Amino acid sequence: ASKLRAVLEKLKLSRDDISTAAGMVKGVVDHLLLRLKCDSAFRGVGLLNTGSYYEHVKISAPNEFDVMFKLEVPRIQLEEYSNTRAYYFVKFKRNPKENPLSQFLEGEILSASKMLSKFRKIIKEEINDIKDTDVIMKRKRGGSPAVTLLISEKISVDITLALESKSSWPASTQEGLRIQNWLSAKVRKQLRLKPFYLVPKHAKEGNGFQEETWRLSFSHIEKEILNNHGKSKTCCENKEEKCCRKDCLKLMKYLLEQLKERFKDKKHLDKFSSYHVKTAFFHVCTQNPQDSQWDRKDLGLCFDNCVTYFLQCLRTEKLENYFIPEFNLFSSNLIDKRSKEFLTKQIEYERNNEFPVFDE
Ligand SMILES: Nc1ncnc2c1ncn2[C@@H]1O[C@H](COP(=O)(O)OP(=O)(O)OP(=O)(O)O)[C@@H](O)[C@H]1O
Ligand SMILES: CC(=O)c1ccc(NC(=O)/C(C#N)=C(\O)c2cnoc2C)cc1
Ligand SMILES: [Mg+2]
Ligand SMILES: [Mg+2]
Ligand SMILES: [Zn+2]
């Protein structure tokens, strides 16, 4: 409680660094968006700001920004890859209409690897052309849909191409977004009328990846929820309604970042990401729908609720994607049992000793 508030103080972002970093990111992004708009296929490219910075849960420093370069793909037809629920082949519906993505077709399917390749190429060539800022592209990460840029050796910007569909969400999402008792049935209905995105993250296929597959992304919905997260419409807008939901997410993120850092002899914890903790945190919100279950005075207890649910996810090897219930982020296919048992032991130790990892 006293300890957790002291940790939260240290995790706060500098107003000075937010102001500079935001301008540096704007300059790079605005410029890249302007170049992609010239290309016939990337004509309708649009910016969506996503991830922890724009959700106000980024911790320690504003040094990693996530952005979606969304592109409306009309008359899209999806084909679920090997019952994965989250990965799809992208096809096109019937009509003699001109297709701006004919270029990247590998038969009747829109290639994710080929479209990401060109997207990355246009960014690579533009980043080393016009100056006033020094921007370097980091090595392509296998599978990952992100094209990572580093601005003046300090701030990372993950840019993902995102196919935008204004059609009803895929059938795999029908039982997801279980926010009815928390944010309301009206809000769930309104959110599901919004577009959904496909990013070029490929499905794990043994040792490699199925390079034509795209994955569902709901980053825009996650942001909306985190920035309008209470049962009360006035949650965190006044001094009487200051909940500890975001503080609990920041503490879970820091717990995982700190354990990953200290066990930097690597491999054990490499597969665990902040998205696992974000997903587990949304499930704890569904489980504790009342703002009275996130009182600032109960910070210790609420954080423990988050820690025990995450420990349950690890032990049960179950962590459902919050939007795609049958997509298990903690399946043995994705994370071996050994790694989950290893993380369980470290989190149990931390929980039993009042989190020495948070000591200064
Ligand atoms: N495995 C995944 N499945 C689905 N969406 C994901 C996944 N990983 C990342 N994302 C989406 O991409 C966004 C940006 O990813 P990223 O790894 O930067 O995390 P973050 O939420 O921004 O937190 P932080 O950058 O502080 O660790 C996430 O907020 C989430 O919306
Ligand atoms: C290594 C690995 O397994 C892995 C899995 C998922 C991702 N990332 C996204 O799935 C993802 C989205 N969607 C994004 O990163 C977004 C979203 N909005 O901006 C950005 C950038 C990255 C890596
Ligand atoms: Mg991020
Ligand atoms: Mg990122
Ligand atoms: Zn609140």
Side-chain angles (χ1 to χ4, degrees):
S2 264
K3 182 166 176 176
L4 301 175
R5 275 279 155 222
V7 170
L8 288 159
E9 201 53 48
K10 183 181 70 184
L11 305 184
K12 286 183 170 164
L13 308 179
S14 163
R15 286 172 175 89
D16 309 12
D17 303 344
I18 281 165
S19 186
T20 58
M24 287 166 76
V25 167
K26 184 199 153 74
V28 170
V29 155
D30 278 13
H31 192 90
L32 286 174
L33 215 54
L34 119 91
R35 165 65 188 83
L36 280 146
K37 273 189 184 292
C38 298
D39 202 85
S40 77
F42 299 99
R43 273 277 165 82
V45 78
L47 171 78
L48 296 190
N49 289 328
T50 59
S52 62
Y53 180 77
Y54 299 95
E55 289 163 346
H56 315 107
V57 295
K58 179 74 188 63
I59 56 165
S60 316
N63 64 344
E64 198 263 5
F65 292 74
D66 304 282
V67 140
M68 308 198 267
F69 274 6
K70 60 126 171 196
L71 186 61
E72 155 107 297
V73 176
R75 305 282 178 194
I76 194 157
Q77 214 205 304
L78 311 176
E79 200 189 324
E80 190 185 348
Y81 169 72
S82 179
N83 301 302
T84 63
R85 303 291 187 253
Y87 302 90
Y88 291 86
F89 292 115
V90 166
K91 301 172 96 172
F92 284 87
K93 288 182 175 184
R94 198 214 248 182
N95 235 12
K97 304 280 176 189
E98 301 178 319
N99 295 316
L101 308 183
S102 299
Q103 190 186 324
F104 320 108
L105 289 171
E106 283 222 54
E108 283 283 327
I109 268 91
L110 174 77
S111 171
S113 54
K114 288 212 152 227
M115 192 169 175
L116 173 60
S117 287
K118 214 217 187 173
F119 180 72
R120 185 179 182 85
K121 200 204 281 193
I122 290 150
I123 298 161
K124 174 241 117 180
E125 207 272 329
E126 195 49 68
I127 237 48
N128 222 50
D129 252 10
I130 287 147
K131 221 198 155 182
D132 290 338
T133 24
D134 286 293
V135 210
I136 281 137
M137 193 186 275
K138 293 190 206 182
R139 136 185 78 89
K140 199 196 190 186
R141 287 291 173 100
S144 178
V147 166
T148 305
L149 311 178
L150 180 66
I151 314 163
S152 76
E153 286 88 282
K154 265 125 183 179
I155 60 167
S156 289
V157 49
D158 287 342
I159 307 163
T160 304
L161 158 69
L163 311 180
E164 179 183 78
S165 174
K166 287 177 169 81
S167 304
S168 292
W169 296 10
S172 64
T173 72
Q174 203 177 301
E175 302 300 325
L177 198 55
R178 286 198 174 190
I179 63 172
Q180 299 93 331
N181 297 326
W182 164 30
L183 298 175
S184 82
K186 285 161 192 174
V187 167
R188 194 186 179 259
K189 183 164 179 171
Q190 294 164 342
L191 295 178
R192 293 183 56 90
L193 288 175
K194 289 176 179 261
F196 64 89
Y197 300 92
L198 294 135
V199 299
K201 196 260 166 281
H202 311 126
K204 227 181 114 288
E205 188 195 56
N207 296 305
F209 304 92
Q210 185 85 93
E211 270 191 293
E212 284 91 83
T213 66
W214 301 77
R215 197 209 68 235
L216 294 177
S217 174
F218 292 97
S219 300
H220 62 310
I221 306 303
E222 295 167 15
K223 184 197 175 174
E224 208 182 321
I225 292 171
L226 274 168
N227 289 339
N228 192 355
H229 59 244
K231 169 168 289 309
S232 168
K233 288 170 187 173
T234 51
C235 194
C236 302
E237 281 206 343
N238 64 74
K239 284 147 185 173
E240 290 72 45
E241 290 186 81
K242 288 280 162 179
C243 81
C244 68
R245 288 185 179 90
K246 291 196 170 178
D247 283 344
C248 285
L249 181 49
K250 289 178 182 168
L251 286 171
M252 285 298 302
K253 295 170 54 62
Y254 189 54
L255 172 62
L256 182 64
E257 286 191 14
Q258 287 293 280
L259 287 170
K260 281 168 69 75
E261 206 167 284
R262 292 203 186 173
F263 283 92
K264 66 183 122 192
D265 284 58
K266 291 120 181 142
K267 296 174 182 184
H268 295 290
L269 300 185
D270 287 351
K271 296 287 176 210
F272 301 106
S273 77
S274 62
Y275 196 64
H276 292 138
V277 129
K278 192 189 190 185
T279 298
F281 168 79
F282 285 136
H283 289 295
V284 180
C285 287
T286 290
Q287 286 171 36
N288 298 274
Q290 303 292 340
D291 297 336
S292 60
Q293 298 175 289
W294 302 91
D295 199 287
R296 176 186 217 265
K297 295 185 279 283
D298 291 333
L299 175 63
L301 178 62
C302 302
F303 179 54
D304 191 67
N305 293 346
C306 297
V307 174
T308 64
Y309 181 70
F310 195 74
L311 278 171
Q312 177 184 295
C313 291
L314 287 168
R315 206 133 53 211
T316 63
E317 300 185 73
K318 191 154 226 289
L319 182 56
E320 294 181 0
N321 169 293
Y322 197 66
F323 300 88
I324 315 155
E326 311 159 76
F327 185 62
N328 183 7
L329 306 179
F330 278 0
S331 65
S332 50
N333 180 239
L334 298 182
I335 310 172
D336 61 25
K337 198 189 304 315
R338 178 173 100 166
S339 305
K340 287 169 291 199
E341 296 172 320
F342 188 93
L343 188 51
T344 293
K345 193 195 185 82
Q346 310 319 314
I347 295 177
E348 283 182 333
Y349 171 83
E350 289 301 326
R351 187 183 176 259
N352 295 342
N353 290 280
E354 299 180 297
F355 306 91
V357 76
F358 294 167
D359 289 340
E360 269 268 278

